[PDB]
Amino acid sequence: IPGLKKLWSETRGDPKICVAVLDGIVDQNHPCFIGADLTRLPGSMSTHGTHVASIIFGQHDSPVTGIAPQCRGLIVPVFADESLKLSQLDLSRAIEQAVNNGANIINVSAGQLTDAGEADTWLEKAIQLCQENNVLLIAATGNDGCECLHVPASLPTVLAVGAMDDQGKPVDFSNWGDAYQKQGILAPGKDILGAKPNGGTIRLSGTSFATPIVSGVAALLLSLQIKRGEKPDPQKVKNALLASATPCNPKDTDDQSRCLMGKLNILDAIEHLTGET
Secondary structure, eight states, X not given: OTTHHHHHHHOSOOTTOEEEEESSOOOTTSGGGTTOEEEEOOOOOOHHHHHHHXXXXXXXXXXXXXXSTTSEEEEOOOOOSSSOOOOHHHHHHHHHHHHHTTOSEEEEOOOEEESSSOOOHXXXXXXHHHHHHTOEXXXXXXXXXXXXXXETTTSTTOEEEEEEOTTSOXXXXXXXXXXXXXXXXXXXXXXXXXXOTTSOEEEEXXXXXXXXXXXXXXXXXXXXXXXXXXXXXXXXXXXXXXXXXXXXXXXXXXXXXGGTTOBOOHHHHHHHHSSOO
């Protein structure tokens, strides 16, 4: 991933920056969280949730190289294991809880498929709560391989995240759609290494694993603002991430709309957010 090392050389996270992971129960005994600052809000262990959290918080030198290892983390489980289906009511409650506990970024590596992006009004209010408190919600576009919308990824003010491979081309499974043209970027989502409950690591593919990468970068970017004596501003960070996305040329896909607003571009994100090149 271009720019990630240069960014790390400036910061690997700041404890003053909190990222909430709304997913399944995380295996807190995994070696990759040794030294990580994690709290779970009020056996049943999730592979999906452990993997996702490890992508963000995996301590360097552990078996997973997390994007933002020194940041504060909140685990706020939104499903019991095995099935990954999500009540909109429960999600809105988790978001509400994440906000009141001082999360700056909220990661949602799940969604619910909808006919046209419509949402339960309590979910809509949860996103409204985030807008009012300057919390950035970042969510997976989904893996239905169609012009299809998930909530909350399709909701206004949310940052939506699809998947690309290593050649920077969009994958078949990654959802696309007009709501996503407005607010989505592609991040790596093929064979991402992360933790497995009980202690191995596994490579997995999906928008579920792209999303935590953008979450981590957004946290790095907020930490970088602190480093520079600027106020951390997650809504500023969203637009920098979107404005810096690099569009796909015709040697990437046939359909240029499968790329959304474009590809995650860390160096340009820094440039757009701060002064720096």
